[PDB]
Design a protein around this ligand. Sequence first.
Ligand code: RET
Ligand code: RET
Ligand code: RET
Ligand code: K
Ligand code: K
Ligand code: K
Ligand code: K
Ligand code: K
Ligand code: K
Ligand code: K
Ligand code: K
Ligand code: K
Ligand code: K
Ligand code: K
Ligand code: K
Ligand code: K
Ligand code: K
Ligand code: K
Lengths: 262, 262, 262
Amino acid sequence: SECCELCVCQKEPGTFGALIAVNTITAIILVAAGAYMAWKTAAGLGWNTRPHGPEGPPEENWLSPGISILCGVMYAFKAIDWASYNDTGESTAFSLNQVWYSDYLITCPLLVLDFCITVNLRYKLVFSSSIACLLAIAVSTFIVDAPYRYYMYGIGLAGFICAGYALWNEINAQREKIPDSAWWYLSAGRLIFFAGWPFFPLLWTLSFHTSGVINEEWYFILHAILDILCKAVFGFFMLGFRLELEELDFKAIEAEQAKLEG
Amino acid sequence: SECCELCVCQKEPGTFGALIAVNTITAIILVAAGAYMAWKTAAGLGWNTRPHGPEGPPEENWLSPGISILCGVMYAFKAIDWASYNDTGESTAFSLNQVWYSDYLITCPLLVLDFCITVNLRYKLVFSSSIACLLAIAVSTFIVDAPYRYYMYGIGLAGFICAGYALWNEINAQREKIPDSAWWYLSAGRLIFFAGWPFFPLLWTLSFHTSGVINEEWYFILHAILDILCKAVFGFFMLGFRLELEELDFKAIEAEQAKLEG
Amino acid sequence: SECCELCVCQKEPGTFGALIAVNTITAIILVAAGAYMAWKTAAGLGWNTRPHGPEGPPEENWLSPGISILCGVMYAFKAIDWASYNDTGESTAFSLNQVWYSDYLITCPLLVLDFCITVNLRYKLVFSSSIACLLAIAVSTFIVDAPYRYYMYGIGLAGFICAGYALWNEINAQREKIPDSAWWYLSAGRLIFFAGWPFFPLLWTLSFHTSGVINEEWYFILHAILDILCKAVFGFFMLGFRLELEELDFKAIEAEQAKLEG
Ligand SMILES: *C/C=C(C)/C=C/C=C(C)/C=C/C1=C(C)CCCC1(C)C
Ligand SMILES: *C/C=C(C)/C=C/C=C(C)/C=C/C1=C(C)CCCC1(C)C
Ligand SMILES: *C/C=C(C)/C=C/C=C(C)/C=C/C1=C(C)CCCC1(C)C
Ligand SMILES: [K+]
Ligand SMILES: [K+]
Ligand SMILES: [K+]
Ligand SMILES: [K+]
Ligand SMILES: [K+]
Ligand SMILES: [K+]
Ligand SMILES: [K+]
Ligand SMILES: [K+]
Ligand SMILES: [K+]
Ligand SMILES: [K+]
Ligand SMILES: [K+]
Ligand SMILES: [K+]
Ligand SMILES: [K+]
Ligand SMILES: [K+]
Ligand SMILES: [K+]
């Protein structure tokens, strides 16, 4: 039928509790992580919350909490949607669970931008737009029928590997500048970027529409954990990196000022 | 049926004259207001149209006329759409009247940005993106079915109140800088922002889909007046503010130059 | 029926080879042109590929290759879509051939921006957003029914003529600055802009939905050539302009440095 054997549209009303629970929990996690990040950025500069200043926190210091909070709002909307599936058995009109990877568009162009701004990686906009385009091909690979979904997957994967290589090069060409104390958080966010991301593309090969190992319910459940790790946990490592840099900057400024007085 | 009792889809062909008229009138108003604003910005700097310069009017001086003109084009498209409802009785393919608050997305992210640029309010992009996201929840609250539209409304209203509080704080933390002559126009645009906006959210509670006091025809008619007051009249007050600032700046420059010669 | 007499939906499975071929060829052309442009921008500054520097190529030097490559990816997706029409006889779920001029949105706001950045034309964002809005009216004129498609066409054409006039003025008010060596490429990209663009609007008058001279198959075939000329060939002239400017800049810097040493 319209709903494939392994879809959430074949599940009966009353059997969606797991999905609502997972999505509410992830909404809370993402929103609260983003709220901690927001508090940390507002409260102060470095690890010891040094008073910001007249201009306040930079506007890019809000990109990171921003994504986490927005993804949490998205997940709350998804859980509201899943609750309609539990009752009415037929979703909402505004369902963020209908189009797969449609929310990942926004989130990704915002995260790659974050990384590229914080680490001062070059071609910030280039990278961010490339990822938006590769995550538009991702949506397509879920909607487009069999033979052509694999052709589209090929294009998307080629570009993903190309952009990944270029990104790797950029981070490794900024390693010299990045202090060793701040590199821990960077390498952790990179690890999240090079392992965690390829996971999204490989889970495709075992998905409900491709193979059929993971049914749509469980695919959705797994993409929630992956979002906690991207979005939320990526931002906590990037928040850490930022704070380390800002504490080291405070230290450097204070030392420069000591030498200025002396 | 698909069309609720109090909808424009239940109205017979030939009974849409009022809607076409209102929407054409508002199109004219918004476009002409934006054109006056455009002329004023191009012609000169302050109230006495002081010759601009080599670079010309700043690109942000076009955000304000821009929105008004675009909303007027939107309303012209809406009136064309309403004319098809008057004749064919079944709308156009490209109807800006189908999805409610879908046009408000663009207009709002552009207006909050305007305010934040002109008054130099901090977190410009943050505020603008927050409003875009809260006006995406607004569209949802019109499409999503009963129980879940109120859950979504709750999220939207929470964020609206949060962003409103934050905005209020920002404007009041910039009051010291803003000259008293320019504050008149600011307080008027703020009044339009804190009263006029909450009106949009309260009319929801009495709308065709929520309660049923205001049928979709009249809801549409009221949202046209509200757009004249937001968009058009908001920009005339903001244009006024800008011009006041620019005239005071011209005065300050001329005084500084007199002291430079002396 | 839903498909008009002169549409690609009336063509039988197996008769789409021409469309696939044209769209694959254009995909290759656009991608390869954009890749040459990308190589040229990365490799060096001017015509003689002068080593760039620490910061590398400006982020706007990627807007031009970018569009060409993205339009090539779009056309590859279109050819994949056309192959489904050749086999299944009913398109893909993600068809870039469904909505007419929907891809032109992105491409156009990116190209006008390019021109305005490279030639330092004023009102860059204004122009780019105007074109995005006029190319949203373009999509409408393909979907909206008879009487109202001509009303929308009128609005779109009025704005197109207005924006065209304003653009002409801007380029002619920057002619004095632009060196004569670089003007060749500029006038060629302008020629592509003032002739080539009006072609898009005039082909509308003879299209499958308006008149019926050009059926949708051949309209699609012609819009592919027009994209090679816009996108691809526009960027090769703009790449040329950029390179000329950069070689002249290198020359000027080297002369200034000779005088600095002397
Ligand atoms: C926070 C959101 C994330 C990390 C989403 C990432 C999405 C991708 C890395 C998409 C990957 C792809 C697919 C699974 C579909 C098409 C092929 C790829 C590789 C672009
Ligand atoms: C110029 C356009 C304007 C002023 C539109 C504003 C729209 C809102 C303030 C939306 C308000 C909300 C709803 C009516 C729906 C969801 C809840 C709110 C408060 C976000
Ligand atoms: C690279 C993409 C290009 C050059 C697309 C350009 C599209 C236009 C110039 C659209 C023109 C118009 C229509 C054919 C429909 C509505 C009326 C116009 C003039 C805006
Ligand atoms: K901070
Ligand atoms: K950042
Ligand atoms: K998300
Ligand atoms: K989804
Ligand atoms: K994050
Ligand atoms: K002005
Ligand atoms: K402004
Ligand atoms: K509007
Ligand atoms: K509407
Ligand atoms: K306005
Ligand atoms: K270059
Ligand atoms: K450029
Ligand atoms: K294209
Ligand atoms: K098309
Ligand atoms: K190009």
